[PDB]
């Protein structure tokens, strides 16, 4: 009976390269004459639910629709209408979603950190961490690329945005990746692409390598003698 509609986030838009909307019905088993449609606030039917999803046996209906053509209109914040109508219900049920307004847009400041010397000495595996921090909206998508190709999502793990104690509006996150010791002693490059709303280009890259951390001076003073 209950219908839940959730809007897509920045991660979904960035990964799928399209805008996908869900108008999902809960605690409703399979009946006939079930109508779901996403319509413009002005009134016109911008898109219909072509290729409707099959009903889940455990009283769940997906009923997802794609507003792929209007990428910018979702970012504009214009309200969307879902029309849920069934024979038993006299008054049609409506679901409304829109982009929130008023939140701050502080930019992230990523700092990529090389592995420690103690871990390298054991010669087992190095773990490069990508300390994304500072973003005001809590939505970040992080991928890892090696020589111009995104690494598989199995190798890295992203933590949820955790509140930052020093400032209320800001947050932070982190991610790790398990590079082999051989492939890091070879001196390859790893990149931590961050996708966020507040970035003017909406993406930022950083690079680390074996040569990223090296000392400069080696001043040695050998003072060999014979008489104390």
């Amino acid at each position: 009976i209950r219908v839940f509609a959730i809007p897509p986030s920045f991660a979904s838009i960035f990964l799928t390269k399209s805008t996908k909307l869900t108008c999902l019905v809960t605690d409703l088993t399979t009946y006939d004459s079930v109508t779901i449609s996403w319509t413009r606030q002005n009134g016109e039917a911008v898109k219909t639910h072509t290729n409707i999803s099959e009903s889940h046996p455990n009283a769940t209906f997906s009923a997802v629709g794609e507003a792929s053509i209007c990428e910018d209109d979702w970012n504009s914040g214009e309200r969307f209408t879902c029309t849920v109508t069934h024979t038993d219900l006299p008054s049609p049920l409506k679901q409304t979603i829109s982009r929130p307004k008023g939140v701050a847009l502080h930019r992230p400041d990523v700092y990529l950190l090389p592995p420690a010397r103690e871990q390298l000495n054991l010669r087992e595996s190095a773990t490069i961490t990508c300390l994304v921090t500072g973003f005001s909206p809590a939505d970040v998508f992080v991928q890892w690329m090696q020589r111009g190709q995104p690494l598989s999502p199995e190798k890295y793990v992203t933590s949820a945005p955790m509140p930052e104690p020093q400032a209320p509006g800001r947050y932070f996150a982190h991610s790790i990746l398990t590079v082999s010791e051989e492939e890091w002693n070879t001196g390859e490059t790893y990149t931590c692409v961050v996708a966020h709303e507040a970035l003017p280009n909406r993406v930022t890259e950083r690079t680390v390598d074996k040569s990223t951390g090296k000392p400069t001076l080696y001043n040695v003073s050998l003072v060999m003698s014979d008489t104390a």
């Binding site: 090696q146 020589r147 690494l151 999502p153 070879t186």
Partner: protein
């Protein structure tokens, strides 16, 4: 006929493996001297690989005439398969780094010029070796046909991991050369003592790393353990065609 099993630059990783002589002195100059500017399509890349296969075939044919040729050519095809697939071990060689540095350009261009129903399938990976293996398996049948021009069915050792195959060339080579060894006796005796000691520690050093029964290496070992009724054996019993496990290898002179 030396394997040069000392570390040197034969293999970067600290574990000791003895490189076969067939890997050394190959006619890889065709792929070595490639021009990534002039080549950006799959069709042009196939022709040069076929040419390299033909050169390898005629090189082996000339080398032998200075079934055994078929076996050596089989393992050479497997080796070239590993070179193209990008999972080779000989990273230490300065010549072989350039080949794996300039095939990345070709396969990056191929991945760039792909269509959507394959772009989403081949989007994720590392160093483009997933679609590299896909391209090899797509064009594997034609390459061996061009190779076999000198002097059917597609070979199967190319899926085998390289280390076990290297063990197989070692077994074939050692049985061949011990057949070559013998067929007064004071003149012949002292060379056999030096014949044992030149390869005496060659067997023991690899046996210490046969434990823990690379990512893809372990799965093949687990599957072959389920079959052949011999899960844990220091001797593979594949094409040995002679006695094994130290029976006549050491101190057979006396």
């Amino acid at each position: 006929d030396e394997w040069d099993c000392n570390k040197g630059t034969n293999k970067l990783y600290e574990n000791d493996i003895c490189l076969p002589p067939r890997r050394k002195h190959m006619c890889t100059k065709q792929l070595e001297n490639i021009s990534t500017a002039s080549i950006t399509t799959t069709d042009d890349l196939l022709k040069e690989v076929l040419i390299t296969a033909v050169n390898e075939g005629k090189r082996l044919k000339q080398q032998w005439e200075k079934h055994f040729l078929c076996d050596a050519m089989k393992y050479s095809f497997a080796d070239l398969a590993d070179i193209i697939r990008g999972t080779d071990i000989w990273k230490g060689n300065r010549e072989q780094q350039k080949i794996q540095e300039r095939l990345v350009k070709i396969f990056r261009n191929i991945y760039d010029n792909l269509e959507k129903d394959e772009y989403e399938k081949y989007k994720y990976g590392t160093k483009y070796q997933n679609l590299r293996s896909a391209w090899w398996d797509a064009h594997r049948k034609k390459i061996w046909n061009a190779m076999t021009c000198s002097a059917k069915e597609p070979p199967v050792y190319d899926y085998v991991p390289q280390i076990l195959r290297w063990i197989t060339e070692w077994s074939e080579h050692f049985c061949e050369l011990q057949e070559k060894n013998y067929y007064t006796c004071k003149t012949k005796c002292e060379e056999y003592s030096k014949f044992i000691k030149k390869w005496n520690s060659q067997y023991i050093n690899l046996e210490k790393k046969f434990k823990e029964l690379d990512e893809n290496l372990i799965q093949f070992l687990q599957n072959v353990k389920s079959e052949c009724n011999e899960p844990n054996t220091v001797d593979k019993y594949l094409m040995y065609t002679s006695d094994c496990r130290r029976v006549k290898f050491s101190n057979t002179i006396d």
